[PDB]
Amino acid sequence: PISPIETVPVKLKPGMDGPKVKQWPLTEEKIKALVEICTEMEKEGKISKIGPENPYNTPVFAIKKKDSTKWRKLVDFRELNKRTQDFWEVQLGIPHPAGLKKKKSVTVLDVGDAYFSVPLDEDFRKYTAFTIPSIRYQYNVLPQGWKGSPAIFQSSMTKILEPFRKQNPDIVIYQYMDDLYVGSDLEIGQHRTKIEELRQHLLRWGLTTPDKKHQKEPPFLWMGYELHPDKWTVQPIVLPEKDSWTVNDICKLVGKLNWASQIYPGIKVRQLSKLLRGTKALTEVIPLTEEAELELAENREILKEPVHGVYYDPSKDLIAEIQKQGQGQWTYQIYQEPFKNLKTGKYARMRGAHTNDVKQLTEAVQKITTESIVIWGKTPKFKLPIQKETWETWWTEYWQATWIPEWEFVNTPPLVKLWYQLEKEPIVGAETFYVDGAANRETKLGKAGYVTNRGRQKVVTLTDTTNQKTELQAIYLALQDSGLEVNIVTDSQYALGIIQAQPDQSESELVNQIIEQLIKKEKVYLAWVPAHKGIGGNEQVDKLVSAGI
Amino acid sequence: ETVPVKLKPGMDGPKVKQWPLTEEKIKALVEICTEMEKEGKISKIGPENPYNTPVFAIKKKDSTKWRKLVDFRELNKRTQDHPAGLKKKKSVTVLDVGDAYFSVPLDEDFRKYTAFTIPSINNETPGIRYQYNVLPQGWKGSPAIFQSSMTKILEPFRKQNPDIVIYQYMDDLYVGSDLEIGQHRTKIEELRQHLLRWELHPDKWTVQPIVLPEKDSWTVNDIQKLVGKLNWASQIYPGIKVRQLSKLLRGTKALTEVIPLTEEAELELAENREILKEPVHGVYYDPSKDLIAEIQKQGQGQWTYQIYQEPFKNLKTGKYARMTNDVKQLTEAVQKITTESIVIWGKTPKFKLPIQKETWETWWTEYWQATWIPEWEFVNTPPLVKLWYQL
DNA sequence: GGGGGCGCCCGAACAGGGACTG
DNA sequence: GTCCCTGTTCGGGCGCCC
Ligand SMILES: Nc1ccn([C@@H]2CS[C@H](COP(=O)(O)OP(=O)(O)OP(=O)(O)O)O2)c(=O)n1
Ligand SMILES: [Mg+2]
């Protein structure tokens, strides 16, 4: 039945007109499914036969559903979509079972032929013209394939449920498209009474709730999960098992793993993700690197284990704990009571040419905080593998504002640490290296080198280089040629900026080499001076490396 | 009857995504909005309205009352197109006159640009969308449209209290006097009664001059730091010089070698110390350009800032000290600096914040207490200028 | 062979600051 | 100015939901 809900007014984008795109061949099997659907819809007013008054046309097809018993009629409105006005999507995210609170009674209802029970704006119907190849119809209800259909449905649904929500403040209705989870703290008799009231309410507005898709007993099938009374489980995840992997099949693999990591702790996708780098198209085959095929195997082992998650109790604390997985990879577990996860997850985003473990930890914390706020509407307390004093040192020597919410240290290696610490004051009995580099923008030739207060000097010629590079190379040279304690004077804000933020990881091989050196040293002090102002003996090394460039 | 309002030419309305809110804030927002909806000030709308603007809520001081805050910065950027004595007053008081705006209806064809969306915890529901029917708090059009009515309400109070300066900026009324505190406060309450019927001290504010080390022995390193600092500062004060100090560094010396200061290098260091105690010459505030604010973290709860419109042409330079939570302190710093700007030039600065974007966005609304919100951008402070403004 | 949402990873485009040419 | 390097956005795959 069609809802007596007011239609939602919709326009084409200006200066534009409906699609005139011609039907495409269709399987004999599909055509019967379509006619069967269309003579039914047409009978019910869902669609109206049109004549030659209607210039427009858009192509229709059909795919078979999960029920493996009914067809889904689709329209490729890709052209009408581009010409249709913008909507503000009202679906802001995806509900998560970990954010559900324990309920005495629970129901899951599906709405029947949901879209086709919501009327489409009358002045807009004409553009939805379609042809069922051997009749010509238009839509009077929302079409599956049009881009306005989801927001108009979700929004319409919210209007319809609002009276019921107001009247029944303490019944919880999770509303994802046409699918409803209904929770109550009523005993099963009184709850079933409310469900019937909710179904009569829906029916009045033309939305049916077929018993076939009305679930009354645990476990409930909801949003890709199985909901048991005291625990939830993700419906089983099956990873592919090829020998030849394409980009498209790495990309589908990474996806299931990421999906999996919401409840399977430890999942890692760095080595797999890196294979995707540089590739040209989906067709492409890539050879699993030995670290990639290794990583894949560990994940495979992880997924073989049995895991569940629990529901949320607002009278307890939210605890998040994080583990360092190496290489800019992190897993976390959110819980309230020990060894009973609410949910898990991973952070692995590489932000920055150069960074270190404390920064990456701070980003993981920030990602988890935002995610906790979506799911539970509050921030969790943290358990982190980083000493209070490591953090305090970092916050003291980093020139940026940084902060981690309430947290406590957990001694679960590998601990997050700073791998070296530049001196705040120059070093007595340390040789002073004045470094520098220049490069010729046209030839791409350069020189890097130093001069020291003890009379040493050295110039290294470079090819296909850049001024920044030569400046990093000079610092690498002073580090290579110095003792365990070294004073380095540079004129490069560039170089000084990277090294002073204390990276332990970098995209740059040269910066990595530098880092390796900085870790070996006992003491390094890095100072800056303005270039080309005759400051000795920045001046002296400037002549050495400028010569010939 | 309604004042027509338009967008700047060739600009569409805001389309900014709502960010996630805490349970507390959503509860406040839903409570506030349902009653605003019952008073006719906002209307539920659908998704065919393509526009959006973020909302949240701050709860004040010691209270149990929240204030909605629509982040109208984008809409204000796209909306169609100051008492010098205010910065002298011994006390300045700041009142929230936002409620006044809901008495004036809003141009029908403009309402759609004021759309906002309320999120649900764990996305239990799609967002709930509203638009305004009256002058929205935080829109730049609101004080403009309501100005005429505002002048008429203050008029008797102003006449009878000639030595009280009252300034309006957005939802705010700045009220300054030279009265003793108590007589000042009794006056403020006189005005609230007056408005019902229908603390700042801009003396204390002081500039933070650039500083030069003074000490009895200098090492090569000390002098190298000094020459680098002075070289930078000479972009602000062209009267700074560094030739004599730099000739002490001739050769290739150890950083910790002690360099005795020659007579002229002692002298040149003396001038510089004085050239720094001058005002920056030739800086003229221009309203056609944004105020720009830089903030540098100096550690130990110390924050330095400069306000300018063109590089090295500072209008003000200052310091902000606190008691530790960097993000909070930074958010407090930003409010104090904005406050000063509104009081001094009647405009809001654009901030260059020394913080990571996600770090700031994750937490800044936990510490926000103003009814306006300044433009900002995030930058990584080159560690050098951190040294330049150093304590 | 269609849609909207969120997530993840990637590369492309573009913005902004520093260093350089003479 | 140009070139270099770094950050951000944003659109393209894929995952999952309906
Ligand atoms: N791949 C999909 C799935 C759903 N939809 C939309 C959004 S939810 C809405 C549901 O329509 P139906 O009533 O035909 O749902 P189903 O076929 O799932 O169960 P029935 O109730 O048996 O009819 O269809 C879509 O455009 N594309
Ligand atoms: Mg259904």
Side-chain angles (χ1 to χ4, degrees):
Chain A
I2 291 175
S3 191
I5 183 173
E6 308 192 12
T7 55
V8 169
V10 283
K11 298 126 43 180
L12 296 191
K13 297 193 178 226
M16 280 177 132
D17 178 64
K20 303 176 210 220
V21 172
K22 300 306 180 172
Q23 193 57 228
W24 44 30
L26 227 57
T27 296
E28 170 60 24
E29 186 180 5
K30 285 169 181 172
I31 300 179
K32 153 170 85 197
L34 294 196
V35 164
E36 157 76 350
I37 288 158
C38 280
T39 47
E40 180 60 10
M41 289 179 78
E42 192 274 323
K43 172 172 181 186
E44 285 187 36
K46 270 54 174 300
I47 60 183
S48 297
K49 300 179 184 222
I50 58 177
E53 327 69 75
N54 206 308
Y56 316 108
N57 190 90
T58 309
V60 302
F61 51 102
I63 62 191
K64 245 188 182 68
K65 311 163 145 161
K66 290 183 184 179
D67 199 349
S68 296
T69 4
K70 297 181 201 309
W71 288 82
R72 162 169 280 121
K73 172 180 196 297
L74 300 182
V75 184
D76 175 11
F77 277 125
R78 272 183 301 231
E79 181 65 34
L80 168 68
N81 288 338
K82 253 166 312 200
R83 296 169 173 258
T84 295
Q85 68 172 79
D86 290 333
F87 307 85
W88 189 259
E89 302 300 332
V90 296
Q91 195 68 41
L92 306 192
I94 315 307
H96 198 287
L100 305 162
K101 314 177 189 201
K102 250 113 183 150
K103 289 294 172 182
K104 196 144 203 291
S105 296
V106 167
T107 306
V108 177
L109 303 164
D110 208 89
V111 167
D113 284 333
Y115 277 22
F116 304 157
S117 291
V118 170
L120 173 63
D121 181 8
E122 187 173 339
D123 286 328
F124 197 91
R125 297 180 180 187
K126 72 185 73 168
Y127 311 119
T128 72
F130 72 98
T131 323
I132 301 295
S134 68
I135 320 100
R136 280 245 296 159
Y137 302 102
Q138 88 183 15
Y139 267 88
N140 303 317
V141 290
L142 303 175
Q144 301 189 41
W146 184 41
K147 86 162 161 181
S149 276
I152 287 178
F153 185 81
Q154 291 145 182
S155 185
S156 294
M157 185 61 125
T158 303
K159 276 191 210 307
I160 297 188
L161 286 174
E162 194 251 10
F164 187 98
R165 282 194 169 109
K166 228 93 192 196
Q167 185 175 331
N168 298 270
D170 294 328
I171 300 278
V172 51
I173 310 175
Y174 269 75
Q175 172 204 333
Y176 194 82
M177 276 296 172
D178 64 343
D179 173 38
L180 313 165
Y181 165 109
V182 186
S184 79
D185 284 304
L186 304 166
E187 291 179 306
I188 202 57
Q190 191 159 350
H191 171 92
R192 292 199 155 116
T193 272
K194 285 293 167 199
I195 295 308
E196 281 312 307
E197 177 185 332
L198 177 57
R199 294 182 53 246
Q200 279 299 300
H201 178 93
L202 289 169
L203 184 69
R204 161 208 171 179
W205 288 104
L207 302 176
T208 63
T209 40
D211 194 79
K212 180 105 159 84
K213 278 152 146 268
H214 180 176
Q215 320 181 42
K216 299 133 177 156
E217 296 302 319
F220 300 89
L221 272 50
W222 181 76
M223 294 299 287
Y225 309 98
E226 276 178 293
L227 309 180
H228 305 83
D230 298 296
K231 69 193 171 66
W232 58 273
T233 267
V234 74
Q235 294 184 13
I237 298 165
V238 199
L239 301 164
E241 265 158 22
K242 299 134 206 202
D243 298 26
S244 176
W245 302 75
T246 86
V247 150
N248 177 96
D249 294 304
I250 305 294
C251 263
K252 322 214 306 172
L253 172 69
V254 181
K256 329 256 268 170
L257 285 177
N258 284 320
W259 167 252
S261 53
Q262 61 177 302
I263 192 51
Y264 288 86
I267 303 276
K268 308 202 270 103
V269 304
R270 177 56 46 82
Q271 298 310 312
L272 296 161
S273 272
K274 265 196 35 136
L275 302 188
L276 289 166
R277 293 222 196 141
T279 78
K280 321 141 197 155
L282 255 58
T283 270
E284 237 161 68
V285 175
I286 293 87
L288 292 198
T289 63
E290 191 134 289
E291 310 80 344
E293 71 152 72
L294 186 75
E295 183 178 78
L296 170 96
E298 326 180 3
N299 292 317
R300 286 207 129 98
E301 279 323 302
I302 302 188
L303 284 188
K304 292 179 181 170
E305 257 70 8
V307 70
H308 64 92
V310 303
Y311 299 117
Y312 174 57
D313 180 4
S315 57
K316 313 285 180 266
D317 267 305
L318 270 176
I319 303 161
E321 79 190 346
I322 307 187
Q323 287 99 19
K324 178 158 143 59
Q325 290 288 340
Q327 314 156 62
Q329 301 194 100
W330 309 78
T331 48
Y332 60 89
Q333 300 148 327
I334 308 191
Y335 59 87
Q336 311 199 264
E337 182 177 5
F339 296 93
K340 292 162 161 178
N341 290 343
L342 273 187
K343 74 185 294 296
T344 66
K346 51 171 287 286
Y347 180 72
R349 189 181 177 202
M350 280 309 317
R351 302 183 100 275
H354 330 285
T355 187
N356 66 34
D357 280 338
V358 186
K359 298 214 275 209
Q360 282 168 0
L361 180 54
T362 297
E363 292 158 23
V365 172
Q366 264 138 43
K367 183 219 176 308
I368 295 172
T369 292
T370 305
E371 168 180 347
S372 304
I373 285 177
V374 170
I375 298 181
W376 301 288
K378 62 182 265 204
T379 306
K381 296 182 182 198
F382 289 88
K383 260 61 187 175
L384 314 172
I386 181 185
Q387 310 265 19
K388 242 57 173 81
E389 219 201 335
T390 306
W391 172 255
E392 282 263 354
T393 308
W394 173 249
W395 161 90
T396 297
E397 73 201 2
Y398 202 32
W399 55 82
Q400 301 265 111
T402 188
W403 182 76
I404 294 184
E406 166 188 12
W407 66 285
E408 211 177 5
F409 163 58
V410 286
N411 197 324
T412 64
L415 298 194
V416 178
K417 74 200 166 67
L418 296 167
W419 286 75
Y420 58 88
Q421 210 186 327
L422 304 180
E423 297 298 326
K424 307 175 181 179
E425 297 301 320
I427 309 165
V428 176
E431 187 182 3
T432 304
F433 285 73
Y434 295 89
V435 299
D436 207 355
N440 192 321
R441 149 185 310 124
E442 307 192 9
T443 77
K444 255 57 176 178
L445 271 41
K447 285 179 192 176
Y450 55 82
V451 126
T452 90
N453 65 296
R454 298 178 179 170
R456 311 206 264 145
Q457 79 181 48
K458 185 193 262 191
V459 152
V460 164
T461 69
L462 303 99
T463 79
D464 184 34
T465 180
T466 76
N467 258 25
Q468 298 75 354
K469 269 149 187 228
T470 74
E471 214 70 58
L472 273 188
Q473 291 268 13
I475 294 182
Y476 181 46
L477 210 48
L479 287 170
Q480 268 180 158
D481 291 352
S482 52
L484 290 179
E485 311 205 10
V486 58
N487 293 306
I488 307 183
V489 183
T490 182
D491 62 32
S492 170
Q493 322 189 18
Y494 177 75
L496 175 88
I498 288 154
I499 289 161
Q500 185 163 338
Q502 292 167 123
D504 57 39
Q505 318 156 45
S506 167
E507 292 159 8
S508 167
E509 194 193 33
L510 178 60
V511 170
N512 277 331
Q513 273 149 33
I514 289 182
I515 285 169
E516 182 168 78
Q517 296 292 323
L518 292 160
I519 288 171
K520 289 173 180 171
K521 298 288 172 177
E522 271 305 293
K523 278 171 171 197
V524 180
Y525 175 78
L526 186 80
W528 178 86
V529 291
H532 321 294
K533 319 213 77 78
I535 312 282
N538 171 248
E539 173 192 13
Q540 268 88 327
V541 56
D542 199 90
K543 310 191 127 54
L544 258 51
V545 310
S546 270
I549 297 182
Chain B
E1 169 127 341
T2 263
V3 172
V5 210
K6 215 41 200 73
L7 290 165
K8 301 200 184 194
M11 280 173 147
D12 207 359
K15 296 180 175 187
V16 187
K17 269 155 100 176
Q18 171 68 49
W19 57 70
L21 293 178
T22 57
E23 180 165 19
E24 234 179 5
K25 293 202 196 88
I26 290 167
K27 264 167 189 154
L29 282 191
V30 169
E31 181 186 316
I32 293 169
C33 286
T34 62
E35 155 158 35
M36 286 182 77
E37 185 199 2
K38 283 197 294 188
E39 282 134 11
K41 324 185 167 158
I42 65 181
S43 281
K44 289 212 184 65
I45 58 190
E48 78 284 12
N49 182 326
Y51 307 101
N52 198 71
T53 292
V55 289
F56 59 120
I58 61 187
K59 98 165 318 194
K60 305 222 141 239
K61 211 196 201 147
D62 246 348
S63 196
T64 37
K65 231 81 184 78
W66 296 78
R67 192 180 177 292
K68 178 179 69 178
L69 244 167
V70 186
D71 175 15
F72 272 131
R73 277 176 296 174
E74 205 67 27
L75 174 62
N76 290 341
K77 265 180 272 188
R78 300 152 191 252
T79 297
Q80 167 275 324
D81 326 280
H82 174 72
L86 179 65
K87 40 159 170 292
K88 326 292 212 327
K89 303 290 153 161
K90 193 198 335 174
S91 287
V92 180
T93 269
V94 191
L95 321 151
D96 181 14
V97 302
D99 284 348
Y101 295 151
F102 300 160
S103 68
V104 181
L106 174 61
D107 178 23
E108 242 292 293
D109 282 17
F110 197 81
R111 292 172 173 183
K112 49 171 194 282
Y113 305 119
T114 68
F116 60 92
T117 316
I118 305 186
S120 60
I121 285 105
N122 193 32
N123 292 279
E124 170 194 321
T125 81
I128 314 300
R129 284 168 64 62
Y130 291 90
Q131 83 183 17
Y132 272 89
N133 296 319
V134 304
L135 297 179
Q137 312 185 88
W139 178 51
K140 100 175 177 203
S142 290
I145 308 306
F146 187 85
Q147 186 188 326
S148 57
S149 309
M150 250 294 305
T151 311
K152 271 156 132 165
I153 317 189
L154 298 195
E155 192 279 330
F157 185 84
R158 284 166 162 163
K159 250 281 182 206
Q160 180 170 347
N161 279 282
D163 277 283
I164 284 189
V165 184
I166 312 186
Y167 179 50
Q168 179 176 34
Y169 180 88
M170 303 288 273
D171 301 3
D172 290 347
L173 217 60
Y174 295 84
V175 186
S177 81
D178 291 308
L179 303 191
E180 142 208 324
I181 228 175
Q183 257 159 244
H184 176 92
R185 304 222 175 86
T186 300
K187 271 288 166 250
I188 290 315
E189 184 56 29
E190 167 162 349
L191 215 178
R192 292 291 281 176
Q193 290 175 341
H194 194 99
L195 285 181
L196 222 78
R197 228 158 82 230
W198 266 69
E199 309 220 339
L200 258 57
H201 304 287
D203 285 334
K204 178 51 121 185
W205 303 351
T206 60
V207 145
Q208 180 52 67
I210 300 180
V211 325
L212 290 191
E214 195 170 41
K215 61 182 67 169
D216 296 329
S217 61
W218 299 72
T219 69
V220 172
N221 184 74
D222 290 323
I223 302 180
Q224 284 182 352
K225 260 168 168 172
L226 184 62
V227 170
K229 190 177 182 164
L230 295 178
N231 188 62
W232 160 87
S234 70
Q235 293 166 303
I236 293 170
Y237 307 91
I240 277 161
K241 239 299 174 107
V242 98
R243 190 169 211 122
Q244 296 311 300
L245 278 167
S246 169
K247 74 195 291 196
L248 302 174
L249 297 172
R250 276 187 176 112
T252 302
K253 295 171 176 289
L255 285 194
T256 49
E257 168 155 335
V258 166
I259 305 283
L261 290 174
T262 65
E263 188 190 11
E264 45 280 49
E266 197 66 59
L267 176 66
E268 163 190 279
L269 175 57
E271 310 175 20
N272 288 325
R273 236 169 214 131
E274 294 305 314
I275 292 133
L276 284 174
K277 207 210 184 224
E278 292 174 355
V280 200
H281 159 82
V283 282
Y284 299 97
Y285 170 58
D286 168 7
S288 75
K289 304 198 289 181
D290 305 314
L291 294 168
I292 292 174
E294 298 200 19
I295 306 179
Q296 310 90 24
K297 162 182 176 180
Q298 304 295 18
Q300 300 206 45
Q302 297 288 331
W303 304 79
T304 54
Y305 68 89
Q306 314 83 50
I307 300 183
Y308 66 91
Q309 299 191 282
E310 297 287 354
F312 311 112
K313 255 84 168 69
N314 295 332
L315 280 63
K316 199 195 178 179
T317 55
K319 203 178 71 143
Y320 182 77
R322 270 294 149 260
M323 159 181 156
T324 267
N325 176 340
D326 281 352
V327 190
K328 176 165 172 297
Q329 275 173 4
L330 189 45
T331 293
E332 271 162 17
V334 168
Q335 291 173 67
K336 195 53 210 305
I337 293 162
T338 304
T339 288
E340 292 185 6
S341 304
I342 299 175
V343 162
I344 291 153
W345 307 283
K347 203 155 67 151
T348 262
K350 205 203 169 123
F351 283 87
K352 283 187 169 53
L353 306 177
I355 188 172
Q356 180 194 50
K357 179 186 210 290
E358 284 78 2
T359 297
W360 173 264
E361 285 176 340
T362 298
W363 277 295
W364 76 270
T365 67
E366 297 290 306
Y367 313 107
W368 197 266
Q369 284 291 307
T371 59
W372 36 250
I373 306 147
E375 317 271 352
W376 54 57
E377 55 161 289
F378 312 95
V379 74
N380 327 114
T381 293
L384 275 190
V385 56
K386 169 196 179 171
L387 261 164
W388 302 158
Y389 283 106
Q390 207 65 257
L391 329 176

